[PDB]
Every structure is written in structure tokens, then in C-alpha cells.
Design a protein around this ligand. Structure first.
Ligand SMILES: Nc1ncnc2c1ncn2[C@@H]1O[C@H](COP(=O)(O)OP(=O)(O)OP(=O)(O)O)[C@@H](O)[C@H]1O
Ligand SMILES: Nc1ncnc2c1ncn2[C@@H]1O[C@H](COP(=O)(O)OP(=O)(O)O)[C@@H](O)[C@H]1O
Ligand SMILES: [Co+2]
Ligand SMILES: [Co+2]
Ligand SMILES: [Co+2]
Ligand SMILES: [Co+2]
Lengths: 599, 587
């Protein structure tokens, strides 16, 4: 039933010849020039890094004055890119060894700090992506200037040159394909993109470039609020200022140097339907954050993320997942700390960004992550004054020992919640009820399902499950102000005839006071969400209510007006339940009822 | 104020000394083994691709040599006790010379030299995957020891073995089957590749559409056919639906299918799907392949951003690949492909609106936000008007629910008409009663009614379409009303500031500026009263007789008009008060 050809049948015969790996050098040069880097512009990043390393070496040799800088020159008339650094330079041996040998890195044998970028020994050859001819003038410290020249076809020549300034100058005779790198504006774009945090001054055609400090690598105390505003505007390409700043450093289990910002501007709803930069040794390298935290701006840097040869890919997908989980938990802890510090400011944050907390809860499969994010949610309570926000953890700490459920109610505003027909039935019990006003709060709590091993249950659902338990409820009005059992059952029989296929059951409830009726569905939250795109509703009436009392008299007094009224009582309860369809078609019927009621 | 040190001051003194470029082979071996890819699991994709190429070379030789139609298979075996991963193909194999040359030399590609000598039309020219010469070394990322047994089809078997540290060994071996067998002794941290389920995940991810059958521990894996390589007619509708669910990881059906084949600027065999299900807040896309091997599960450079709602596959045998085989090189051919594909999809969707306008109306309802996003995002005015051909709006000349396009409108204009006008309103009731729509109606003419979100932002960025700019268009006696008017103006001073009289519904709400209406749905309405309605003449009578009932009645007339104007879709705040009004009315 299985088809396998792999069997241990091979046996070594005689001696073995030992060999050594070889390399096709000319083929390797073509690979680096045509297939290594996915974008041609990164040759500027490679040459600047080499200039930075050469300067870092000279700075190290200054322990035993001279200017230490990088100069870029573009000539559109001759189509040349030129970079010159004032670093250690290279002698006759170093030019042949370092530049002539692929994968040979002098920056490897130099050790023996953490300010060197090169390690692979191939980055220099990126110049042959954009240039047909490359000239290198190098003058070593102490040390006879030499000129290195090649075309990238597998051969180079070296001759002694005079008048070579200390350091190294490299001239790229650009191909006709890549004349854009003889443009000053284009070259300045690439420098700002990849090399904006170099530790040495960079000059472009005589003008000094506005390099920045890598704030994420600095001590948080040495960073002012003004410095964070400037950095936020650069990394987020924004014009405002951050309302929250998280500067997170860690060394275990992973190296982390990061800064996250929350914009003071509210998120654009156009951009929400359609964020953080990753760096290494202060060079841009472009997953890191969960989807629901995409509203964060800033920078993440981790020495534990290996880069591929082209310096544009991350190699440890298991570490990125682990990094993302660490960052996620650190942001949750930070946001909770903002709630306790300034709850008024956090109330505006949750109002502008709370939608991301709800998305994260709905789209996550891990229950512990759902509950971690749910700690950020804020609601009102029936046990607290109006306007005072609370949380699920604060609700849990008020629960008695004998309770195992968290009750909530979803209504547009505080007044509708306090005077809801579903909260009137809950007042007969002595449980606290969360008041949730946001449009997607019910969907969120439905996906959350439980918090701290306590089941979430809506007021509407609990009212229906009480029907299948004990009738432990008393009417808010004495029996003298309600219909008798003969009168109520006579009314219920008429209602079932006038509302055949519209309702499943009609019953009298002793749990209402101000409202004449209500609609109950066991899975009310799921019905309200499905309506965002004829079910089996139950109509529960208040026989103590004057409007219901008048309905019983109208079915014999004015039978046609009584049916018109019954339809409006049903519609009012459907609207109040959040289960109404289009409210426009009922306005025509309601105006007809108002004229007839007013004689 | 300038400071430049770059000056032409160098002059060569002496003679040149010529040298050839070198390679530090031991360091380079390490670079190509672990520094090329983003995932170490890639060694499985590389070794299966190499075995496919060996099988392809064997199939090509048999066109002339005429073998016997050997099995031609790829077999994988895992051993979780010894920690080994084994792959064997029944392909063309390698003698001792080819083992030392191909395996021992970095960037040496025998498949590349095979491709160069083939006739450019031969079948094997478009299906051989190798070219770089480094893919095999990815095994040393996951293995401390690599052994290769190979038997060529000529005349002796050989064993090639190495640890990946500069040297390798070659010896004669007996019992070596025709083809190549590679045994990887997995490192401790890469033991997962000795697990059957893990190997099956990698094969499915990258090599699911390899031509030749693939066996794992005696069980077949690649059962799916590359549908994009077939003739569009020879593909039935049920095959597209089943292939769509696989490529899109979906569970519905495609509402639109575009099977696109072309040869310029690149060879392209592609299949695009539009899902039948709407996008949701809780949330793959078009994958890129090359010679049946996955390059990117989410292609980035081939389609514009606004077409990210499309699902499916694009395969190109000659697109310039990055060394990592998970990226594309920067190429003018790839930039032209994106423009060709953009025009192709636009044309396809335009043909669907002619083929089935009702079905296209449902499509534009679900995915119109991507058309609108495309017009705002792109910078070329020519592609703005191309995407604008897909836009649909309502009109004042057509009844409600009927749609028209910008081209399906520039025709019905008058002869001397260089302008076209639109009105972005929440709904039709507000648009038909907009004071600016009356002005655009007195001078004949017709206004587009735009109700969708960002419809205003779309037409503003559109500026001009079809060489024509888009310019926004922005019984009760004789005088018993003022006694009711001034009473109505006073009872709701905080809601409206203008209450008029206009000759079913007792009253209606109108809004002056439409920009203020959408701000309210996230203003100053004009309550227009009719003197002839019963509730209005009843409100005038109850005004002084029953003041409590008159206040509840006025509030209900106001709220009912707000509902009829679409400015109140959740009438929950009124239910309790309406119940009090009904009770006091039926005394
Ligand atoms: N501007 C320079 N001045 C002095 N020495 C240099 C300069 N550029 C390169 N070198 C030397 O030549 C060597 C060639 O480096 P190459 O750019 O090929 O790779 P790398 O920078 O060592 O490593 P990577 O490939 O990771 O960038 C370097 O190790 C360095 O020692
Ligand atoms: N069965 C086989 N498995 C792997 N390589 C083989 C096989 N038969 C022949 N070869 C040769 O080994 C060479 C090494 O290829 P590799 O280093 O992976 O780079 P590429 O695949 O791009 O040529 C191939 O070009 C191919 O000619
Ligand atoms: Co054995
Ligand atoms: Co307690
Ligand atoms: Co000169
Ligand atoms: Co040819």
C-alpha cells in the first residue's frame, strides 16, 4: 500500500579522494551585480557603510584631530557618483586582498567596538550594479597612493598614484541605465532613507546633510519631550506630536531597542480600511507588531535578528514571532499604566483608538491574548455614577463569592442603559451590569466569551434563561393595577391572532415597570450582529402598564384602532431591542396611528 | 559656505599590475549556506527543485535516446530516531566528474549550461529551475553532514560526502540506483525536519505544483495541478472553484475568473479571481510563481495596491529573480507588467459590466472602495480615468436604485455641454431636496447623485474625466401658521433655526450643505411644515388646549421627519417618549 524506493543498499568501494571546494569567480561577480540586491539604489548604502567602517577604524587608531567625514559628489554632465572618506585607507596589499577577493572582509580580521557594519566581504561589489567602471584611490595612514580600477568582468589592475588624500575616494562611472544616481535630489533621497543615522558627517556636493541621532539606542532620560516630537515627526512623516511615547529597552530574552508613538491626531478612517521601521546598526532594513497595533509609529531594533546577504531579509521567523509577543505584552502593560496615571487622557485614547483593541480581540485565537487586550477596554457600570468609566478587572473585584458571571448591557448612551427595559428586569436581581456604548462592543464581548474564568452574559440573554428556571420575580405594581388572569389571557389570545407569523410566543412578564413590552431573543447579541447585513422573537407584555391596559379595552372598543396600536407596540419593542429593520416604512403607519388616536 | 574635499588631484605614476578577482571559498561556502534565505526550511525547496531538473534532463534525453519511461519520481524519507532527512530522485544522475564539478564549485550550474545548449523552444527550456549554482549548499544550513549517492546513465556509482567546512570526499559506491540520493544528518536545532508533518508543510508551501510525483515515506504529496499552465478552454468551471479555494485559502466560489496568458514583456501564465464573499474587518492574496515554484505567497511588484482584492496566481518563467528566490529584481519588464495587468483587469471588469450589469452592480457595491482608493492613490491622470470607467453613481434623471457610469452620461449631455456635475449626499431624499440641486435643475441639466463613502474624495482627486472636469454642484387658514410656527420655533430652539411652510408626511427635514450632513452621521436642518396635514392642524389646536400633549406631538413630528430624511437610523432614544405620547393620546 506504500511506494518507497529509498533503501540502505549503497556501500563504499575502495579508497576515497579528498577534494576542496572551489568557486566560479566571474559567475559570482555577475550574481552580485544582477541578482543579490533587489533594488539598485542600495549601492549608496553599501559605500557609505564602508566609509563609516574605515572612519571607525581610524577613530580606534586615534588612541595611539584629522577631519572624519564622508563626501558625496554627483556629476550629471559626466554621469559619475563619487564617495570619499577620510578613514584608514588601504595600501597595496589591502587593495588587492580586500577588494580583489570576494567574501574577504578586512573588518573581520580587525576585531581585534560594535560600530562596524561590514562582515560578509561582498558589499563593495554592489557598485557594479550601477557602474561600468569603478576607480578607487586609497591612501593608508603612515604607509604611497594607489589607484584600483576594474570593470567587474573578472580582472582588476593596481598602479601607484600621487596626490592621494588620506582615506579612500571611489568614482562610479554610472551605466546609461542608472543615470538617476548622478542627480543630487535622487542621491539625497537614498542617503536619508538608509544612512540617516550615520555617526559621521556626510556632505553632498559641499553641503552638509542633516543626519539624525538614533534615539532608540540612547538613554530614555537623556531624551526630552521635544526630541521625541522631532523624531516622531520624522519616523511617522507627520506634522503633529505624539500623545504617548514608549521607549522600550530589553536584553533578555532578546535584545530590544525600540520607541513607539501614538499620534495625537485621531486615525483617518480612510487609512484604517487600507507602520514601524526596523533597523540594524543604524541602517534601515525592511511582521514585527500584531495587526491590531498598526496604529503605532516608531522604530524597532534587535541585534538578535540575523540579516541575509543583501541586508533586506530577516532570517529567524521564530524569533520575530517571539519578538512580536514580547512587544505586544509590553504595549499592553504600557497602555494600562497610562490608564492609571491619567484616566482622563486614556479615555480620549480609547475613544480614538479603541476600535483596534476590539479588532485584536475578535481576530485572535488565543484566549489569554483576548483577555490581555480586554484589560484595555473601558465601560460604565450600574454600580457607579454616570460618566465614571470602569474595567472588567474592576468589575471582577466587586463580584461576590457566589457569583460566576459578568453581566453586560449594550445601549447607545448612559440614559438608554439606565432606563432600558432589560435593565429593569435586571434590577430585580442584585448583580452589577456593565454599560457598553460603542457600536462594536457587543461583538467584542461575544468573541471574548469569558474573562478571568467568568462567563460573559448579556442582560437580554439572562432574561430569557430565567424563563427556563424559577419564577422568582414580583411585579413592580400591586395586583390591583394589573389585568386579571382572565383579562390578560383574553388579551394574549387576541395578540397571537393579530401577530401570527411575526412573533413566536407572546407572554406576560412581571419584570417590567416603565415600558409596556419588550422583545426577547436568547441569542440577542448574535441576532443584532446578523442584522448588520423574520427570526423567532418573543413579545413580553406588562399588564400593569396603562398602554397595555388601554390595549385590552381597545380590542372591544375600537378593534381596528387596537390592531393599529398593537403593531406600533411591537415595532417600538423591536426598535428598543435593536432588531428593527428599516425605520422609514413604519413612519407612515405611525402617523396614521397618531391621527386616529387624537380623534 | 560650501565644503567639498573631492577634487581631481590624483595622477598615476608607474605601470599597472594586473590581477584576477579571487574568492575566499571557505567563507563564501558559509555565506551561500545560511545567509541567502529568510527561512532555513528552504533547503527542501532547493533539493526538490534540483531533483525536478534532473528528471527534466532525463525526459529530454529520452526524446532522442529513447529509454524505457522510467518511474521518474522524487522520494522523501524522514527518520526521527537518527535525525536524518533523505531525498532521492530517479533523474539523470551524476558521474564522478559531474559530482566534483557541480557540487564542489560554488556558482557552477550544470543546469544553466544545459539550458544554454537547448533549442529555445524545447519543453525543458521553460521548466528547468536552477541557474545560480548555489542552491544545493542550503543543505549545510540544517545538516552537520551531507552525503550524496549518484549513479549516471552511461557505461559506476559514487558517494559524495562533506561537512560543509571547506573540503569534501568522493568514493566509488555499489548498489546506487539510477539517479541521485542525498542524505542530510540534521543538526540538533533542525531536528524538526526529521518529522513527517513538518516536511509535508514545507513541500506543500513551495513545491506543491512540481511536475513530477513526490513521495514522503511512501505517500504521495503534490496532487494539485498547476491550472495556470493549461489552455483556458480545457479548464471547467468546477476546476476554477476548487483551485480558487486552494490558492485563496477560501471556502466560497469565485464570482469572476480571468485566465490571462501572454508572452510580452514577460512570459506570464496567470489566473485571477474575485471572491464572491465580501471583505470583513476580521482578517492571502495573489501568489507569484516561476516555473511552478512559489516565489512569494503575497506578490508585491506585479499588481497595483488597489487590485489587492484579487486572488490567484501569476507565473513567469523569465522574470528576473533575486538570489534568495523569494524576491524580484528591479526591472523595467516588471514595471511594464504591472501596467499591462492593470489595463487588462480594468478591461475585464468593464466587459463584465456589459455582460451582466446586475451582477456587476453587486460587485461594485462590495469592492467599489478599491476603485475609489485607486483613483486617489495613483498619480497619472490617464489611469485615474481608466479606473473611473468602473465607477457607478445614481442620477436625477434615473429612478432610485439604478446606476450610471461617467461614460454612460457624457453621451446623454446636450450638444453645447462641456461640464458635468455631481452632488455627494447621504441618501436620495436629501439630494432631491438640496437647495443647490434646485439651482442646477432650473437651468435644465442633470446632476450625479453620489451616496457612497469617499465618493466626494474620489471625484475631487479625479478632477477631470473624458477631457471634462468634475465640478461639484455646491388648509390651515392663511396665517394661523405663525402662531404655530413661532411656537414650534420656540419649543426646539436647540435643534433647528429655520421652520418654513411648503405646499403624505406631516413635515420633512432638508439640509442646506451636504458636507454638514455626513458630519452629523459620524448641522442646521430646515423643518418644512405642511399646512394641510391633519397632525399639523391638530398640533395648532393642541398648542393651547393640551400643552403637554402638544410638546410630545411636536417632538414626534420632528423625529419622524428626521427618520424619513435618513438622518436618524436608530430611533431608540424616542421609544420611551413615543410610548408616553401614545398613552396620553388614548385617554
Ligand atoms: N572606503 C574604504 N576605506 C578603507 N577600507 C575599505 C573601504 N571600503 C572597503 N574597505 C575594506 O575592504 C573590505 C571589503 O569590504 P566589502 O564591502 O567587500 O564587504 P564588507 O564591508 O567587509 O562586508 P559586507 O559585505 O557585510 O558589507 C572591507 O572589509 C574593508 O576592510
Ligand atoms: N539529482 C541532482 N540533484 C542536484 N543537483 C544535480 C542533480 N543532477 C545534476 N545536478 C547538478 O548539480 C548542479 C548544482 O546545482 P546548484 O548548486 O543547486 O545550483 P543550480 O541548481 O542553480 O545549478 C546543478 O546545476 C545540476 O547540474
Ligand atoms: Co547504510
Ligand atoms: Co471579593
Ligand atoms: Co583629472
Ligand atoms: Co537561445
Amino acid at each position: 500500500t506504500l511506494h518507497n524506493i529509498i533503501t540502505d543498499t549503497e556501500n563504499v568501494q575502495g579508497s576515497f579522494s579528498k577534494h576542496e571546494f572551489q568557486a566560479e569567480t566571474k559567475k559570482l561577480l555577475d550574481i552580485v551585480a544582477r541578482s543579490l540586491y533587489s533594488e539598485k539604489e542600495v549601492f549608496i548604502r553599501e559605500l557609505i557603510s564602508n566609509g563609516s567602517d574605515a572612519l571607525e577604524k581610524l577613530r580606534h587608531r586615534m588612541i595611539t584631530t584629522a577631519p572624519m567625514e564622508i563626501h558625496l559628489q554627483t556629476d550629471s554632465v559626466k554621469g559619475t557618483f563619487t564617495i570619499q572618506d577620510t578613514g584608514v585607507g588601504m595600501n597595496k596589499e589591502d587593495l588587492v586582498s580586500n577588494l580583489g577577493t570576494i567574501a574577504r572582509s578586512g573588518s573581520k580580521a580587525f576585531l581585534d567596538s560594535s560600530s562596524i557594519i561590514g562582515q560578509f566581504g561582498v558589499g563593495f561589489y554592489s557598485a557594479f550594479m550601477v557602474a561600468d567602471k569603478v576607480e578607487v584611490y586609497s591612501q593608508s595612514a603612515e604607509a604611497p597612493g594607489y589607484k584600483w580600477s576594474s570593470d567587474g568582468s573578472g580582472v582588476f589592475e593596481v598602479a601607484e598614484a600621487s596626490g592621494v588624500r588620506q582615506g579612500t575616494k571611489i568614482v562610479l562611472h554610472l551605466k546609461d541605465d542608472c543615470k538617476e544616481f548622478s542627480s543630487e535630489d535622487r542621491v539625497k533621497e537614498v542617503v536619508t532613507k538608509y544612512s540617516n543615522f550615520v555617526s559621521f558627517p556626510i556632505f553632498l556636493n559641499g553641503r552638509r546633510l542633516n543626519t539624525l541621532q538614533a534615539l532608540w539606542m540612547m538613554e530614555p532620560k537623556d531624551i526630552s519631550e521635544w526630541q521625541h516630537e522631532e523624531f516622531y515627526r520624522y519616523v511617522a512623516q507627520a506634522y503633529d506630536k505624539p500623545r504617548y511615547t514608549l521607549h522600550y529597552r530589553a536584553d533578555a530574552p532578546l535584545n530590544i531597542r525600540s520607541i513607539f508613538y501614538v499620534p495625537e491626531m485621531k486615525p483617518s478612517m480612510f487609512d484604517v480600511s487600507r507602520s514601524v521601521a526596523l533597523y540594524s546598526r543604524k541602517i534601515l532594513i525592511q511582521d514585527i507588531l500584531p495587526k491590531w497595533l498598526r496604529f503605532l509609529r516608531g522604530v524597532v531594533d534587535s541585534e538578535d535578528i540575523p540579516l541575509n546577504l543583501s541586508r533586506e531579509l530577516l532570517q529567524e521567523s521564530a524569533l520575530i514571532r517571539k519578538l512580536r509577543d514580547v512587544l505586544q505584552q509590553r504595549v499592553i502593560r504600557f497602555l494600562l499604566d497610562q490608564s492609571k496615571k491619567d484616566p482622563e487622557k486614556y479615555a480620549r485614547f480609547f475613544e480614538d483608538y479603541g476600535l483596534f483593541m476590539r479588532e485584536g480581540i475578535v481576530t485572535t485565537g488565543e484566549q489569554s491574548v483576548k483577555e490581555d487586550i480586554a484589560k484595555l477596554l473601558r465601560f460604565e457600570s450600574s454600580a457607579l455614577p454616570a460618566g465614571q468609566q470602569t474595567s472588567l478587572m474592576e468589575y471582577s473585584s466587586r463580584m461576590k463569592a457566589g457569583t460566576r458571571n459578568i453581566y453586560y448591557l449594550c445601549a447607545p448612551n448612559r440614559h438608554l442603559a439606565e432606563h432600558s427595559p432589560y435593565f429593569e428586569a435586571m434590577k430585580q436581581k442584585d448583580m452589577e451590569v456593565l454599560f457598553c456604548f460603542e457600536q462594536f462592543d457587543e461583538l467584542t464581548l461575544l468573541h471574548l466569551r469569558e474573562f478571568d474564568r467568568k462567563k460573559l452574559i448579556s442582560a437580554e440573554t439572562d432574561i430569557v434563561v430565567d424563563h427556563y428556571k424559577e419564577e422568582k420575580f414580583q411585579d413592580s405594581k400591586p395586583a390591583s393595577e394589573r389585568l386579571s388572569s382572565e383579562q390578560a389571557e383574553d388579551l394574549l389570545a387576541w395578540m397571537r391572532n393579530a401577530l401570527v407569523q411575526r412573533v413566536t410566543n407572546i407572554k406576560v412578564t412581571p419584570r417590567l415597570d416603565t415600558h409596556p413590552a419588550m422583545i426577547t431573543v436568547l441569542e440577542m447579541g448574535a441576532a443584532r450582529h446578523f442584522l448588520r447585513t423574520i427570526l423567532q422573537p418573543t413579545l413580553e407584555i406588562n399588564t400593569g402598564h396603562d398602554l397595555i391596559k388601554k390595549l385590552h379595552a381597545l380590542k372591544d372598543s375600537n378593534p381596528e384602532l387596537a390592531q393599529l396600536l398593537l403593531e406600533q407596540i411591537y415595532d417600538n419593542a423591536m426598535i428598543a431591542a435593536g432588531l428593527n429593520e428599516d425605520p422609514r416604512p413604519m413612519i407612515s403607519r405611525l402617523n396614521q396611528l397618531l391621527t386616529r388616536a387624537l380623534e
